[PDB]
Amino acid sequence: AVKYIPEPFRIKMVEPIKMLTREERIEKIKEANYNLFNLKGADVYIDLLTDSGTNAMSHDQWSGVMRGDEAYAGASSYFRLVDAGKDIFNYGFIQPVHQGRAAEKVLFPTFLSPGKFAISNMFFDTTHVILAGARPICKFKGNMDVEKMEKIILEKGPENIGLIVMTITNNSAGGQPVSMKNIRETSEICKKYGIPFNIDAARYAENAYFIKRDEEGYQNKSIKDIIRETFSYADMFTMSAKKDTIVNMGGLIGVKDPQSPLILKIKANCISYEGFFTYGGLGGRDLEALAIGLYEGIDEDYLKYRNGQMEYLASRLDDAGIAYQAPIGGHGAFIDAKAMFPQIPYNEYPGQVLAIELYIEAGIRTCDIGSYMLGNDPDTGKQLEADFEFTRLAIPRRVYTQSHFDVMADAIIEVSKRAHEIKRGYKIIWEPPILRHFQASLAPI
Amino acid sequence: AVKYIPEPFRIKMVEPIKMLTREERIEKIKEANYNLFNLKGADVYIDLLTDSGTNAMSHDQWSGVMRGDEAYAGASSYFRLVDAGKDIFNYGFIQPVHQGRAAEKVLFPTFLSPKFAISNMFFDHVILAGARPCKFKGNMDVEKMEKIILEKGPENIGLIVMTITNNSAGGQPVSMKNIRETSEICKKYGIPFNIDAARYAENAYFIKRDEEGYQNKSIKDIIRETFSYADMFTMSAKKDTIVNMGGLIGVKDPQSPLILKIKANCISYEGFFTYGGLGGRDLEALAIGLYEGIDEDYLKYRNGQMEYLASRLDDAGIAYQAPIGGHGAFIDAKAMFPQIPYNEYPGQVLAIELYIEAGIRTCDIGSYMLGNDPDTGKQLEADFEFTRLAIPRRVYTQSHFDVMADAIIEVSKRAHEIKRGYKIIWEPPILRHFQASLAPI
Amino acid sequence: AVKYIPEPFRIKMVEPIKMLTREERIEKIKEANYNLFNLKGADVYIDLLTDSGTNAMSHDQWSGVMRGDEAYAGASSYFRLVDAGKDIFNYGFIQPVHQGRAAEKVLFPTFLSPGKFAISNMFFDTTHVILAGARPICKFKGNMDVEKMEKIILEKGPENIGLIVMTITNNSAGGQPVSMKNIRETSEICKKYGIPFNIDAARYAENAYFIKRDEEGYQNKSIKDIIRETFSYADMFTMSAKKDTIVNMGGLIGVKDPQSPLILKIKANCISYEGFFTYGGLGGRDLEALAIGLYEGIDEDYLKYRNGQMEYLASRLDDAGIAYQAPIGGHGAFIDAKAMFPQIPYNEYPGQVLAIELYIEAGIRTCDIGSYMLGNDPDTGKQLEADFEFTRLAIPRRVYTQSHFDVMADAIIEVSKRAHEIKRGYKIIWEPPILRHFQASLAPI
Amino acid sequence: AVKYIPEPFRIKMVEPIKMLTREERIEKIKEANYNLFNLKGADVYIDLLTDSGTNAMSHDQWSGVMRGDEAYAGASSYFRLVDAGKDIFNYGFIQPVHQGRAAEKVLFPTFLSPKFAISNMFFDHVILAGARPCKFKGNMDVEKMEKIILEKGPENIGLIVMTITNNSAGGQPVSMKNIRETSEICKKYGIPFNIDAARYAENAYFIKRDEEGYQNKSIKDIIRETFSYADMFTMSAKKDTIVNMGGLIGVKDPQSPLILKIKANCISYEGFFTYGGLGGRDLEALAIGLYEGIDEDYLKYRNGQMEYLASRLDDAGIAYQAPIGGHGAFIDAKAMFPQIPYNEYPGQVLAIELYIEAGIRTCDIGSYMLGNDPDTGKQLEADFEFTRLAIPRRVYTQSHFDVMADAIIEVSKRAHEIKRGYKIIWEPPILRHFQASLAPI
Ligand SMILES: Cc1ncc(COP(=O)(O)O)c(/C=N/C(CO)(CO)CO)c1O
Numbered sequence A, C: 001a002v003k004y005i006p007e008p009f010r011i012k013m014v015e016p017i018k019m020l021t022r023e024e025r026i027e028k029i030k031e032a033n034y035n036l037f038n039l040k041g042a043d044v045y046i047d048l049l050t051d052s053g054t055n056a057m058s059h060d061q062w063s064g065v066m067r068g069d070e071a072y073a074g075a076s077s078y079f080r081l082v083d084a085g086k087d088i089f090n091y092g093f094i095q096p097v098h099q100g101r102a103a104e105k106v107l108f109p110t111f112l113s114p115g116k117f118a119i120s121n122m123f124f125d126t127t128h129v130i131l132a133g134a135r136p137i138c139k140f141k142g143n144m145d146v147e148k149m150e151k152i153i154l155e156k157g158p159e160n161i162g163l164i165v166m167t168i169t170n171n172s173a174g175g176q177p178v179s180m181k182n183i184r185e186t187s188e189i190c191k192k193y194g195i196p197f198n199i200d201a202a203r204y205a206e207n208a209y210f211i212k213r214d215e216e217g218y219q220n221k222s223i224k225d226i227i228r229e230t231f232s233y234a235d236m237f238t239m240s241a242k243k244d245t246i247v248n249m250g251g252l253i254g255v256k257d258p259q260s261p262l263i264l265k266i267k268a269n270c271i272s273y274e275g276f277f278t279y280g281g282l283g284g285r286d287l288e289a290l291a292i293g294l295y296e297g298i299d300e301d302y303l304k305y306r307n308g309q310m311e312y313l314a315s316r317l318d319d320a321g322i323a324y325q326a327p328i329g330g331h332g333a334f335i336d337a338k339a340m341f342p343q344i345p346y347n348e349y350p351g352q353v354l355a356i357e358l359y360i361e362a363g364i365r366t367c368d369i370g371s372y373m374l375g376n377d378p379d380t381g382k383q384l385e386a387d388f389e390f391t392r393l394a395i396p397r398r399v400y401t402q403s404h405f406d407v408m409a410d411a412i413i414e415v416s417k418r419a420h421e422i423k424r425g426y427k428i429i430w431e432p433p434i435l436r437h438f439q440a441s442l443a444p445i
Numbered sequence B, D: 001a002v003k004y005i006p007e008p009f010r011i012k013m014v015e016p017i018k019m020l021t022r023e024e025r026i027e028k029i030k031e032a033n034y035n036l037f038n039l040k041g042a043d044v045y046i047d048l049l050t051d052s053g054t055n056a057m058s059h060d061q062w063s064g065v066m067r068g069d070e071a072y073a074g075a076s077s078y079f080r081l082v083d084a085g086k087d088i089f090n091y092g093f094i095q096p097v098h099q100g101r102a103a104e105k106v107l108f109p110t111f112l113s114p115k116f117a118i119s120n121m122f123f124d125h126v127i128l129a130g131a132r133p134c135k136f137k138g139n140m141d142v143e144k145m146e147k148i149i150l151e152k153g154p155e156n157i158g159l160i161v162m163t164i165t166n167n168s169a170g171g172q173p174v175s176m177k178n179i180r181e182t183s184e185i186c187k188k189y190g191i192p193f194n195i196d197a198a199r200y201a202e203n204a205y206f207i208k209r210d211e212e213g214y215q216n217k218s219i220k221d222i223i224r225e226t227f228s229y230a231d232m233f234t235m236s237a238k239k240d241t242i243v244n245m246g247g248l249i250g251v252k253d254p255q256s257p258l259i260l261k262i263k264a265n266c267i268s269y270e271g272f273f274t275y276g277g278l279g280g281r282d283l284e285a286l287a288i289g290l291y292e293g294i295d296e297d298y299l300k301y302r303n304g305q306m307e308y309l310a311s312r313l314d315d316a317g318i319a320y321q322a323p324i325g326g327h328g329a330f331i332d333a334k335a336m337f338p339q340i341p342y343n344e345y346p347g348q349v350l351a352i353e354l355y356i357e358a359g360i361r362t363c364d365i366g367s368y369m370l371g372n373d374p375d376t377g378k379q380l381e382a383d384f385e386f387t388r389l390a391i392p393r394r395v396y397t398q399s400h401f402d403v404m405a406d407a408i409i410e411v412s413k414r415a416h417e418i419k420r421g422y423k424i425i426w427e428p429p430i431l432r433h434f435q436a437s438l439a440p441i
């Protein structure tokens, strides 16, 4: 096995959880129509459904919550945020926004005229985007296939590609990172063919660690700098802060160039969608927690602990013989449901079978990243077959302990030991035509 | 001669304000290009930009903040907020959203196919039909509305929206009868009826205070009645729910098929529909604030703030937009600066002078605000020139209100000494009033 | 009339209050046996029962509440407190304690050997103390009769007087202050006859203002200094922080001399009564609110507002013809109950008649500072006759508005207009032998 | 081979700790005169001085903090706390106080006329009669107690006090039978019986875990039973009620005349009896914490922390004070440093070495603590040499516990390389261990 990294903090406030029996948990998931999204938080012991804005802040951040300035125009709480923003990244301009998705709505359009296409390093997407994720063909997976991109900027005109977005770490692979090298190289093609380069930075901090730890020549290099370097190869960044700023709400747009015409556009855009640009849909409370949490997320001791959780969980899973995305990513594990349940074909949803079944085991709450989540064909209506059947364990930051990770690994191993008994997957009782998996009702066969 | 109504509460926590030199303040505004929006809030004493999202909460709301469930799906806080809304409004479906903008963004798409909406608002595919401005001056001109419906053809009227209180008119309330009569014309033509409900409680008190035969009904019943006439409502919670973040959609009929579109629209625009862009803390604060903002003792106090201020303005013969609305005061800036023509911005001079005289931040609701012509760029001549004093809830005391009245009278007295207003130096193409740069002549 | 001084702050959190009818308030006070101390806070609209620890803090103080260090030995929250303490007063040593009464228990004994007597500037007392309060014989009332004291240090031996305590402002007079001059002069006799001088400093800040405002030659002098001067004429101070540090809990002992042998004694004493001397019975939360609130209480803008409340209330009362302690004190007004109810003799308690009757009027809660509070003779058992019948309005800091002060003045004037109708006072149904007024039950005649 | 019990809760707020260099830490302790009490808490990683008042509260407790009534008389918070106590303990009277010291100061005067008290404690007009130290080792030696009562004469025994858990023995629990048997001897001689109840819930779980025929009873019932055998109780709330401030007196019989003395004693020593030296925030936190600290899921977890730690100590053959108590670990320091004689303080060397090895603050419970003779001044030879690891509640994780075990094993392994302990340089006359100054030889 491997050793866990003990928390470079101590616990100051706890949220008590009601403990259920398995017979109770069975009733819960049956009452939710076997859709884990219909469970009540109160009935979930370890909630791994997402790492987005479910983190535990510090008593420093809560301190700033009480000091939060709620002024419409010009809150003091706003400058402390932009001052951090300009420090950490060294960008010229920083703009608060309420959600990660709202950062894109504010910025992307100015450069992305309807009809222009942009390439990213992703595998899945909700979207006119061109996906050139480097084939896993393991280390630093989730790079951009710089070759593929470079040729895509020619099969599709150069003055046509609206922009390139490198999201770091790459979510759609499992949180795998991006090499300082894959960033210079993606940068290079961007300056030649004149395309703007944006970094989607939701898990930028976990990414910097993965560089310090793995990319050759960043061993003794400062985390603070490994960040500030990544944001030299980019014209701009958009961010969901709910991730690596260990916060509960917020998003951030930054443009390196202080004089970049985008700035006057972003302010006007923000005023229209979010509100006056010195709170950007964000509260004084949240601006404070976000200017402080920007730095907690960077601290190298916290980054080592956090990487170590993942390492610990992966070691433990190696050791029991369970299949997961081999180089485990920044923020959690992806269990291969089709491997544990070869009896369940894709259309019976092996992902939900594991997810449902892990909840029944220890009140852990996961979600299918597989055929259930993929949905039905937008035109044919027919159920799509996913490349992989994963169930995802997304880990909110600074909230679960080693003891909970043992609750997770162990619950996984228990379903393995009895997987052979579930002879049938699930079937869909009712579903809307769109965002199916959020809403649908299922039953067993 | 009106007397202030004492706060039904005591102060529990304080935000200290650094007091500035009248000398010191002038540098602070010159330094900020004579545009109030550039002032740092720390250099503002009475800050009256908006009543949106600047309210003081209660300790009950804050113990809410500490208990807030941050779960992505199924949080405790969401179910509390849902119950509060179902109970107050007697609707079958209440959707939490992050802003009043988000609630319109999510709800209106369904029926507003690129078709008109008719609104009782007075400025802004919207058609306006507020009555010509006496009580209940936010009322919608029902005769004119029916005229429009037929002139466009019912087909082409997608929804009808009544804003209560009618902000565009100063916070002038809408009669319970006006709603009932608007509802009946919607039903006649098969047109959905939505209430814009940001200041529904101030409107509820106004009905109680002035509509015949409601003197005796409770705010609970008054609110339940006014929403029974509608199909749905959208609202920025940042006003009468006494919070700093929130929006809220309600659909009356529990089986309406509109609900699945709302849920789908929300999942995609804001996030999963059990948080809808809000956090644990804010859904908590919101579920408690819903009831605080409609308390009968609070609303009598809230309306008292406003009666008092107006009473003082009347004692000095100051011309304001009368009767005073539910949430602030609009000072006739042209009434007080005739020497100041529209294109030199009488509303922006009075708002600078109030921040010189007493550290009160206000804004212009006049020529300056409304900027140039879409295609000409020549300064538009606003129909009215005002300076808006927008009062956050439970934040300021009778004393602070006296500072306000005092500053208006004093500026009044020396208004004849200013004979020339201001002039945009720098300006963006759109939205200038927020971020333009001014200077005097 | 006079103008009120508007708050140099704005309201950030409110505590809602349930509003009662007079018929409801009548039921409350009857159910409490006409003892105002038996009322429930929830049934009191404006609670003037004390200004001790009922103040409203700032969002700065609450900010520090969340950052509070709860370490037993050596909390960071303790040094920020002593650092303020040594700044404001310039004393060498500062020691946190839980209550104002606990500061005395910790310090006084070391110097006050059983049998030695000490003189103060007080009128009443719970106590072997000698009281030499300057006869009102109005301005700067509540000085020490330096003459009387000086002769008391001779009728009672000089090497016998354990210490002199000048409490500022003087509570027992009504919050009237102490002149920088009365402090030098009381200091002088203390250095000659070798007696230690302690300042009881519960309302030191209100006192400094009264000096800046009234004592000749302190007009243009800094509040920060007018404090630091007062604590040059003293060997030590004890303090209930619940007063002019705008806090909810805490007490403070300070000794000017850094090398003063008392220090090693105070630490040992504190360890025995309160706990380890780096929290002194105080919580990390409370140490933070107290190090920040030390400075809010000093701010000259807050001191002008606060003095102005009192001035405003007194002006208004002058104007209606109501009798109160003429030079109104730092922290509230004392209404002369015997003057409004000449029908009620002392033994029928005019104080409680007004107090009860003001509650019935507007849910204001006061207390008798008169014959009811004085109690019965410790030996004879017979009801004592007080010098004055006051009912006290003690004003917590930064919690009530001008509108509430109008609620107070006006409720007073209403009982005046109908005082002639109460033909009889109250009688005691049951009382314990000690601290009578806190506990006793009354009825009307 | 024991497995930790996972926390019945998730972390909601964090206190970050600056990690120090083993090099850096040595300066920090030398700089602090080799006395752990001088270390600044910011330079401590795992801080195990006391479990008194260092516990982590819950968000429910903190929303309590925000709602706390600060009224001088009749505060909401007081009535909540009173109800909690009446309900948990089934007593007629519950008096809030600020500390466990304050509760004894207020209650004991009445009967303890300058007369003896008999206690089951093992160190300290107190007479001790704990059994000679197997389970329930905090038990009171009932036979010896009755011997004493008669040897002094009942007249001269003023009250009898059972401490649960028996701190002086390491947190060793007291049997429900031991209480029942002590109660019966009190009743026989007309002697008041008081429970010292600081760790009553850890004791309740121990009874459930080990006393025959309680495996099936609930903690609610177990606690109600153990207090039914007593007349009154005093307690520091800072331990098993999972708060940072508080004490609490209870009197069983609702009509007892003792109550008016308590109220009078309190009004005079602490303050009016509806706050009793506590504030709004702390009475709130206390009323919620009462129930949290006795939850059955929590107590199984709490006891698991301790079973785990001991299990690790046993895997390495580390000698600790066994069986492990409810609230921490006492490491036999003389067992680990024989080369270290009592007067060179083996407990103070192990506690320095643990803070060198891993930033764990512990303290000596041995010669160093117990200081010189009242009249001689020569170093007393403690009966036992220990180092106390006192575990605050809901603050540390299995990982942190592994740091602790790891640091003890490592120090163990290199203990033979230290052949000479420490030597008081400076010292006060009383209480030296807290504030003395040490150095090595
Ligand atoms: C009825 C109503 N509905 C929605 C809004 C927008 O508020 P929000 O989207 O929550 O930031 C407003 C804001 N209106 C103002 C002040 O009135 C703009 O003048 C908010 O800045 C409103 O009055």
Ligand SMILES: Cc1ncc(COP(=O)(O)O)c(/C=N/C(CO)(CO)CO)c1O
Pocket (backbone or CB within 6 Å): C274, C275, D050, D052, D098, D099, D100, D101, D102, D163, D167, D196, D197, D198, D199, D235, D236, D237, D238, D246, D247
């Ligand atoms: C049963 C009991 N009762 C009262 C106390 C004193 O705690 P307190 O007066 O609330 O500060 C203690 C403290 N005992 C210590 C740690 O055990 C001293 O060793 C608190 O520092 C106690 O164990």
Ligand SMILES: Cc1ncc(COP(=O)(O)O)c(C=O)c1O
Pocket (backbone or CB within 6 Å): A050, A051, A052, A099, A100, A101, A102, A171, A202, A239, A240, A241, A242, A250, A251, B271
């Ligand atoms: C799980 C999850 N939720 C939400 C989002 C969108 O971010 P935000 O919630 O900040 O809009 C993302 C993508 O970044 C995500 O991965």
Ligand SMILES: Cc1ncc(COP(=O)(O)O)c(C=O)c1O
Pocket (backbone or CB within 6 Å): C050, C051, C052, C099, C100, C101, C102, C171, C202, C239, C240, C241, C242, C250, C251, D271
């Ligand atoms: C009303 C009042 N309560 C209490 C006290 C005692 O102070 P503390 O509450 O800090 O012990 C005093 C005296 O200073 C007082 O005047």
Ligand SMILES: [Cl-]
Pocket (backbone or CB within 6 Å): A070, A071, A072, A279, A282, A283, A284, B052, B053, B054, B244
């Ligand atoms: Cl805001």
Ligand SMILES: [Cl-]
Pocket (backbone or CB within 6 Å): A052, A053, A054, A248, B070, B071, B072, B275, B278, B279, B280
């Ligand atoms: Cl969230």
Ligand SMILES: [Cl-]
Pocket (backbone or CB within 6 Å): C070, C071, C072, C279, C282, C283, C284, D052, D053, D054, D244
């Ligand atoms: Cl503490």
Ligand SMILES: [Cl-]
Pocket (backbone or CB within 6 Å): C052, C053, C054, C248, D070, D071, D072, D275, D278, D279, D280
């Ligand atoms: Cl208090």
